């Protein structure tokens, strides 16, 4: 599934995204815009055999098993394949164990190299 | 499966630290994010802090630079270190992991003259 | 710090009948509130995760539902062995912060 902006808005706010962890609802619109393009089937194979999926991208080296990716340890403890959902239940709740870490949003290299430090208002502007 | 257990002292004195240790079985310690909660006198709950594998802890402002949480990820433990400690800190001791899926038995810690 | 409010402090309950437990929030908490259960002498239990979402091994008569502020806890066909402390607990914001709690008793 492809979610236009505002229904991703929509689905995210539901799902407690909002102001989690001092992360306004723009910053997750505006990651899942350029990490994914608002595509939850969205994969991308990395050089060392993990891969990131979903619509923020999550990855198979810590987050989730997908069975094939060497040395790895799978935090969330679900299988990759339910990040591949329309729904986005399973990826909000591991995306918000990952940003619950010192790290934050830096997780996502999109979001820190496009949408900090910008208005991420204009993400939910309409809506 | 995972079990945790508390241990050290149970009675402290006023103005030195308190020096809790949680063990931890199976393989998931490296992977997750580990907790202290303590249960006051009246069923009054306060989440103490967090510590994260990347090394970054959050910490509860009451606890005014008190606290530190701390990993040896050689020997699947994590510690807690609680400073200058008065009456006000006598309480159960709880360690757990993030989530709230599994948790450790208490360890009453009384701080008395 | 967001406060959470549980009402009431206490029921008492005949087993069979059914309770509904609140857990009001000071600020919106979106889908972030967690519910446990603490028997005496023993660790706190989680029930429910996220305001509604099931917890395998819990009894599946314990459900939640509710959302910003106002979030509900129901226990249909109660039991004895349901007896203590219920508390709710939010991870919106840090420091992650519990409601005072709602004891339930058995009547006889």
């Known amino acids: 599934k492809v979610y236009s902006r505002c229904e991703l808005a929509a689905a995210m706010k539901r799902l407690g995204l909002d102001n989690y962890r001092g992360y306004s609802l723009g910053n997750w619109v505006c990651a899942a815009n350029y990490e994914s393009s608002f595509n939850t089937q969205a994969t991308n194979r990395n050089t060392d055999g993990s891969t990131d999926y979903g619509i923020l991208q999550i990855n198979s080296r810590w987050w989730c098993d997908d069975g094939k990716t060497p040395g790895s340890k799978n935090a969330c403890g679900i299988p990759c394949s339910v990040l591949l959902r329309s729904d986005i239940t399973e990826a909000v709740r591991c995306a918000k164990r990952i940003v619950s870490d010192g790290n934050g949003m830096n997780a996502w290299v999109a979001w820190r190299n496009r949408c900090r430090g910008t208005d991420v208002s204009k993400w939910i502007r309409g809506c | 499966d995972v079990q945790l257990q508390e241990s050290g002292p149970s009675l402290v004195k006023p103005s030195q630290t308190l020096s809790l240790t949680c063990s931890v079985t199976?393989?998931?310690?490296?992977?997750?994010?580990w907790s202290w909660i303590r249960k006051f006198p009246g069923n009054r709950l306060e989440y103490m802090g967090y510590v994260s594998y990347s090394g970054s802890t959050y910490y509860n402002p009451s606890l005014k630079s008190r606290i530190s949480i701390t990993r040896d990820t050689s020997k699947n433990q994590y510690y807690l270190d609680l400073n200058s400690v008065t009456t006000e800190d006598t309480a159960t001791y709880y360690c757990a992991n993030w989530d709230g899926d599994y948790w450790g038995q208490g360890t009453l810690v009384t701080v008395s003259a | 710090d967001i406060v959470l409010t549980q009402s009431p402090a206490t029921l008492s309950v005949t087993p069979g009948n059914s309770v509904s437990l609140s857990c009001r929030a000071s600020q919106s908490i979106g889908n972030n509130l967690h519910w446990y259960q603490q028997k005496s002498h023993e660790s706190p239990r989680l029930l429910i995760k996220?305001?509604?979402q099931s917890i395998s091994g819990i009894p599946s008569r314990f459900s939640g539902s509710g959302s910003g502020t106002d979030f509900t806890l129901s226990i249909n066909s109660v039991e004895t062995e349901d007896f203590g402390m219920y508390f709710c607990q939010q991870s919106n914001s840090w420091p992650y912060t519990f409601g005072g709690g709602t004891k339930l008793e058995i009547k006889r």
């Open positions: 199976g393989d998931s310690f490296t992977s997750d994010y």
């Open positions: 996220y305001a509604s």
